Paper text:
Histone deacetylases (HDACs) are evolutionally conserved enzymes that remove acetyl modifications from histones and play a central role in epigenetic gene silencing. Yeast Rpd3 is the founding member of class I HDACs, which forms two distinct complexes: the ∼1.2 MDa Rpd3L deacetylating histones at promoter regions, and the ∼0.6 MDa [name] targeting transcribed regions to suppress intragenic transcription initiation. [name] consists of three core proteins: Rpd3, Sin3, and Ume15 along with two dedicated chromatin binding subunits: Eaf3 and Rco1.6 The structures of the yeast [name] complex and its human homolog Sin3B complex have been recently reported. Here, we report the cryo-electron microscopy (cryo-EM) structure of the [name] holoenzyme binding a nucleosome at 3.7 Å resolution.
Sin3 is the scaffold subunit, which wraps around the catalytic Rpd3/[name] via its [name] interacting domain (HID), middle-domain (MD), and C-terminal domain (CTD). Our structure clearly resolves an intact H3 tail (1–24 aa) binding to the [name], with the unexpected H3K18 residue poised for catalysis. The ϵ-amino group of the H3K4 side chain directly interacts with the carboxyl group of the D261 of Rco1 PHD finger, which recognizes unmodified H3K4.12 Methylation of the H3K4 residue shall destabilize the electrostatic interaction. Therefore, only the H3K4me0 tail could be grabbed by Rco1, which explains why [name] is restricted from binding to promoter nucleosomes marked with H3K4me2/3. Through recognition of H3K4me0 by Rco1 and H3Q5 by Rpd3, a [name] tail is delivered into the Rpd3/[name] active site for catalysis. Since the H3T11 is immobilized by the hydrophobic pocket formed by Eaf3, Sin3, and Rpd3, the H3K14 cannot access the [name] catalytic center in this conformational state.
Numbering used by the authors:
A (entry chain M): 85 to 124, 258 to 480, 487 to 525, 534 to 577, 581 to 591
B (entry chain O): 260 to 367, 543 to 587
C (entry chain L): 2 to 386, 398 to 422
D (entry chain A): 1 to 24
E (entry chain K): 660 to 729, 748 to 1040, 1058 to 1081, 1110 to 1320
F (entry chain P): 218 to 401
G (entry chain N): 218 to 400
Amino acid sequence: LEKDSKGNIIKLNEPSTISEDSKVSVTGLPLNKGPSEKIKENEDFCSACNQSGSFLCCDTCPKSFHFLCLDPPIDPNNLPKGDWHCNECKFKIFINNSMATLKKIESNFIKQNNNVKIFAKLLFNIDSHNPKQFQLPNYIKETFPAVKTGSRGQYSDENDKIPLTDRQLFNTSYGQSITKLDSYNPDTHIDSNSGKFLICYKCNQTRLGSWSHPENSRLIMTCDYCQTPWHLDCVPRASFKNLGSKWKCPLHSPTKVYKKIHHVNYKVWKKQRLINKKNQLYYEPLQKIGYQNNGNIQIIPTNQDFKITQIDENSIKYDFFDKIYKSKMVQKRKLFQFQESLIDKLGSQNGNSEDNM
Amino acid sequence: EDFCSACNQSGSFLCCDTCPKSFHFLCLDPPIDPNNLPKGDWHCNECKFKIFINNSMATLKKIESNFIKQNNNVKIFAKLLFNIDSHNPKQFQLPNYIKETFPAVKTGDENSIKYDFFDKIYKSKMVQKRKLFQFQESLIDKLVSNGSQNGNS
Amino acid sequence: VYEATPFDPITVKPSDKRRVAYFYDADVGNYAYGAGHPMKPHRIRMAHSLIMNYGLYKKMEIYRAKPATKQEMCQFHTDEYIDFLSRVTPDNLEMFKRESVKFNVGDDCPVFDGLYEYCSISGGGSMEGAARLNRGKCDVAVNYAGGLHHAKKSEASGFCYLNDIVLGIIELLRYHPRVLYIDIDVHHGDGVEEAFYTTDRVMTCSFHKYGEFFPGTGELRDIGVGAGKNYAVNVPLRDGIDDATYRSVFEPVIKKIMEWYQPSAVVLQCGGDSLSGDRLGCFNLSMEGHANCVNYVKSFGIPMMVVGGGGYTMRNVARTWCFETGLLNNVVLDKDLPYNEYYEYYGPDYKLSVRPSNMFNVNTPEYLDKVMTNIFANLENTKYAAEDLGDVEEDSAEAKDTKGGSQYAR
Amino acid sequence: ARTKQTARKSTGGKAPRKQLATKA
Amino acid sequence: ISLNEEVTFFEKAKRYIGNKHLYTEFLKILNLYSQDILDLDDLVEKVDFYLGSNKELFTWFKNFVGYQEKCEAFGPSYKRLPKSDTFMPCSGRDDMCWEVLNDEWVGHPVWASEDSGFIAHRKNQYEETLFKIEEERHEYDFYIESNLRTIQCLETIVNKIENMTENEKANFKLPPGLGHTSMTIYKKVIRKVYDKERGFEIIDALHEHPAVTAPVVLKRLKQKDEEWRRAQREWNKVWRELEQKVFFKSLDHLGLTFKQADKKLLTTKQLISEISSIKVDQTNKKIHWLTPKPKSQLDFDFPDKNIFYDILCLADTFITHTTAYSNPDKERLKDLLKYFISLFFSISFEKIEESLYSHKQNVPYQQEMSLLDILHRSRYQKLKRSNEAKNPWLTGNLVEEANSQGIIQNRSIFNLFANTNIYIFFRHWTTIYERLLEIKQMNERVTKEINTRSTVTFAKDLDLLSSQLSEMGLDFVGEDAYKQVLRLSRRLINGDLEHQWFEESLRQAYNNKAFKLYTIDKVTQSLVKHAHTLMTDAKTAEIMALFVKDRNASTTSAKDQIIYRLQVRSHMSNTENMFRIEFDKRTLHVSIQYIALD
Amino acid sequence: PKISLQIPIKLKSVLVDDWEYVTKDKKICRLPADVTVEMVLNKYEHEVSQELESPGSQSQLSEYCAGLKLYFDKCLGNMLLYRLERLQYDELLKKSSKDQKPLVPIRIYGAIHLLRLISVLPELISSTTMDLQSCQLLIKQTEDFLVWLLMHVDEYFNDKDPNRSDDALYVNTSSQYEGVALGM
Amino acid sequence: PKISLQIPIKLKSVLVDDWEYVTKDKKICRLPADVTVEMVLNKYEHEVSQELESPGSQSQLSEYCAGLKLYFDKCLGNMLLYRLERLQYDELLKKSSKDQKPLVPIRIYGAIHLLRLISVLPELISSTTMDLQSCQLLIKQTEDFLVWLLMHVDEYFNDKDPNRSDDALYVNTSSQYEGVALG
Ligand SMILES: [Ca+2]
Ligand SMILES: [Zn+2]
């Protein structure tokens, strides 16, 4: 360190080598070798998001904001100099200490802009509230029973599997891991409530193997909607999928269909969302055969335009057969027309049809 | 009133007590000859409908929904058959639209379902066949003055 | 099309006598990720220390690739990302907060001291390995320092900051019309698959563990889009794959690819994670079952490059990388370690073996037949048909390196 | 102005990143 | 007629799909096609998951709709980015790179994980010790080696100064990196030794004035090298022995959890659930695949005889040692196993007695003691004191033997009709045989391997290889592996050998292959306990009272088996489900059939 | 809105002219008529059956056809008859009562009364609660039905061999009968 | 008190889908949309002006269109943006200053963002202090707008897959855009 550059250097500093290295001190020997030897004020949640992150804190009141949320957004690199206030506190300061009665301040605003008068109060009020994250009002989310707000404000549906308890993921004995049943659990091949075996749908077997030979066992999981057991082999499937979302078994109708027009290249169909029970209207049409369901159906055993058509089963037989027979007639027509067409393009036919028999 | 709603003219009346409207004996859905009269009430079809259902919407929708499900044999004519019992009889009146076009006017089981499915399929088959066949005999007739096959298979 | 067959001893093929080129930069051992981090660049140094003691330097040609420039790193990565790498240091982390979230750097992939230098050692190491194959100087390039297949265009994932393999492949692509990439790391090689997904000039055949295992991509149905449809091939294996079952899958698939889509070069990423006992990967592959993968690809006779990739247990990966370096030089090594500086590691029998575990093999032959059937269905569509370029400068490192590694201590 | 901080620097939360800060 | 099927296709479909909830979805899918929402090819693909097995039906459906066999395959992982975001620049991308590389399509863990995170593979309690040791290894190794690379860098420098003139020494600054290849390494090493921050003005002093700085820094760095190495050597012994105690356990994933999973899955319940599971499969398909109902749901095979003398001598040791069974009764437990085995498996009894006798040697008269005598206590003391009508054959399948008209004269085939407590006693007998046999099959390969393994010369001169087992003798160096595994097990029941030392010896000897022989002491115990039930439980003993007479009968008519079956059924309650264990003398094949008849 | 049903132009004359005769000439059809409602309508179920190829199209044909046979039965005594006709209808019920056999309007009356029902039809759907799609079909057979009618409109609506009074659908009646038809 | 706004079910089902794309699917709408809040109200004000005869209502209509535009400019910054869209909004402000033209949200944002303002209108009305006769004036007028929006729902809100069309109203988000916005 310090040193008459011409003279020798004074030693920098006696190394305070107390490192607390993963081993106890890098220079220190092992200690006692007992085992291992055989012989011997501002809130912490953004007022807008209600979540965590880097915050920019209001000075007057205990309200913290993200860097993105506050309007307008503020760069983390470049910030306004000195003290900062939330738009609410700036309002109160603004109002206070000047033309203090709000009324008179507001009474000037309404008189200022008489054209927008119907919206006058709403415009004036918006200058006082802090920035917010948009959340759908409850009367919209309550319309659809399936939808529900997640922990973070997410859209969470009936499809999203309910989260695993954090204990179940990380607190298990070694032999049995709940998350993956990749250790020969034979109680998978049993129906808990009834006691019968779960039978796969593809091969109509359960492959519970002997404890003597576990490689004869094949893994089985059950649908999250159907509750029809499937082998992880029959639906080719790599694993159990118990984290992300409910596993829709094959054998369950499509909820979204991309149809190529074969001439935009494609058309999209999405099943109508399930409405609240009271607002739902189920309708049985007077026309048995050929009603345009648009894909929304309740199978009868034998402004609300969101109406689930109720169709008899015998109707679907007629509809499906009706579609098939029409296409077969059309396909036969085009093929027969094309063969007749080459005759149309044709003194002597010379088709040799008389020779054919 | 003085006129008969179903004679559209002034007639001797049999009167339903509940409804002020009364009708002439001739236009009786079941003929009701004056000489033989019902006892006092003579409830009209429209009035008879209300007392039958007891002026209840839920049963009305239910007795309707039952009527459609009952007449699965003829479903498209379900609401029409359901309504016709309630409405009081009315003289046939040539509708205005057909009149308006003309310039001038003078006077002012389980096996059954399979069988019902089978025969329609079976009836469909020949229609499919005979249309396909008629194109084939158009092919032989495309060859002029004689069929290409020269015979019927 | 999966025929279970018992494992056979690794046999060397006298027909091929390839002249290898080994890329070792002596500094690459001195970089450490963190206090408890799994990626340990030490494993390159031990895997090199073992190699020199077998005397493999008598057959190989030792090279020290010139570190990759800042510009050449950008032919895959966006200029914003590389610029962040150069400045970032543990003391500078406060200054960079928007970037450290935008660029997934410093939280799981830590910002250790020397972050730029280590990445600069990896790329020039793989890039030049491709450059030497093109010139015809070497039929094989071995760059264990590199192989980081998890990095993305503007993101650092899976301990991998600079995706050298893309830099390596782009160098091969300037001479060879078609290049094949083979992944045997237990994780899905999303860094290379996502880079070449559209083009047909590269096929990225990757073997990995599916079932919400990082990065949770590489499902069987991912076969590329656009021109590169069917030119991607993912084989999602289950847990506990072992020596005999892996060979019955690896060999049939690779043999199909090199028939239908004839590659001019191969980039084989010898991942260490698949071996048994690693801290983050769950397979049961032993050395003989893992090094057999290299011996099979070599036997075809087309120029290849071997990159180290990921290996998380230093004891196991250093042993198998030395054995694989033996096979490429047409020599099967003896199962007796020679004295080396890092000798106390390879306990307890002190032999060159990675012992397979007892864990239960779950891939089932009924499942593996369905995976291998779909792949073969797809592969029948893939019928064949301060800048430095061709960085070639190599440095001739062995004169400097012979005293390292080779030990007569007692 | 005084800005607290962020404790953890990633968008994934390390649940999807291996050697997680927050998932083992 | 062709019309007949079509008017019944939905009836045929309804029967196969089974439950209504699945049939409704089949109707909804058929709807979407008729609404022109779903393409024909997509319809046939979905119907495949319903009617895949009924090939005769599915083929008809494919024929009916007109399906003809022989992009939108995007994949679930990757999503497209907008066109604008692909413009973020790359400085050194050639024209070629633009065509090859991918910029539009991207995939990330937070999307593929569905935001719910991942599951890491679980690790042992011991396999996490080799990971703690690995880090402690690297931490010492990283600092020392990174220190050496600076020593050589400075050492070549320092010798240069002493060559130079003192005036010259005044001006010999070192460019960054000291001329070395790595600019960063020599900073992380000096900063560690010299107190963090203080360390920064060392480097500046090292560059600006090296002639007086480099000699001092080299001195200390060597001195810090000597301290660090002296620690590693002391830490080497701690790490080496700890790795020796817990290495072979880390590989052993199944062995650690075996002892608890053995008593859970080897019970009277699961052994009946396992065999019943095979019976339902053959009858389920009968419902769907139409498999015929066969005999012998479970099949065993007994290729090697000498395992029987091996199991008997094991259970012989446990019976004598056991304190629970009273001494007079233990003579029946010993004499049950020899006679039952000599009866069921055709082995001559005298041959068994020599095998036990020799095992007694390793450590006065015999009248004919029938197994029938053993099963009743009252008759036992005497040999201790001395030196149904109008019942036609209808089942056919239950009694396997319909071989000959009238009476079969000489048949190897013999079936034992059994209760639950007979079959379980027999499954406890095969369970040992399966576990023992797979050891003897490896015995030829393993015995050679254990002998031929050799110590590395570089690990024998130094004291590195573990000597714990050699002192205790539990390394199979001097004997064949299988015969040694027995005389280790015989010590386990005797209690001489600790459990954790018995297990560890088979870990090194068999590379963890033979983990099933961790509960050979308990499975032997449970086998004896079940065999005890046979003498007691006079209902069950009366069953083998009939069996011994049947097994002794050379000529058994077809009706005789039915006579044998019906009498045995009389002794069980009408609820219990009897088993049929069938033996084939020529092929030593034992087939168990699960029966729950009238 | 209001249901739009198109009568063929000649059929419009058939009904409008026919209404002229009953009010003025006071003619009444000989009953049972020459062409019954049944064989007119049952035959429609026969020819059109051999023309439609689809299974459903065969069902809808018999559906609408059999219903019209049912609808005409209930809707005869209510609406389709005139003041003069109603007097003639009353007799029938006594005539059916004297036989004790049930009165069946469809087999007895002529096709022109069926044509009267179709004219009143679009007003009748208006009172009902059927959605549009169902109403379309009810109309679509109806329009396609009357398209048949023009082919044989000459046979039975139009007077074939008109010289004989029996061929004429409606036959003149006595004035004192008309006095009873007035009811006063 | 509590103000009730009858949103037709189809429009009430769009929003929910918009709530799904932005929070679960993590895709945002292409900001410079084709049918922006300005021409949507320009068409509606123009289609309904000819429809109604009385000049008294024309004043009521025109100010509700003129007012809703001015309110939308003030409102979009504060409470019409999900968290994931804040960064995209910021880059527009950051682009505006460089382009030296002030951002006007009605020119940029699409019809769906107008529907977000309509959804929280009852909550905004209840917070303030307004005449009751004006509360039914807005709500009745808005209920008349939503009815008109229902008749044209097809060609404003179309369901196109972003991976496919690229003309879809929503575009996916890069792993770097998502990182800063959420992190
Ligand atoms: Ca590709
Ligand atoms: Zn990996």
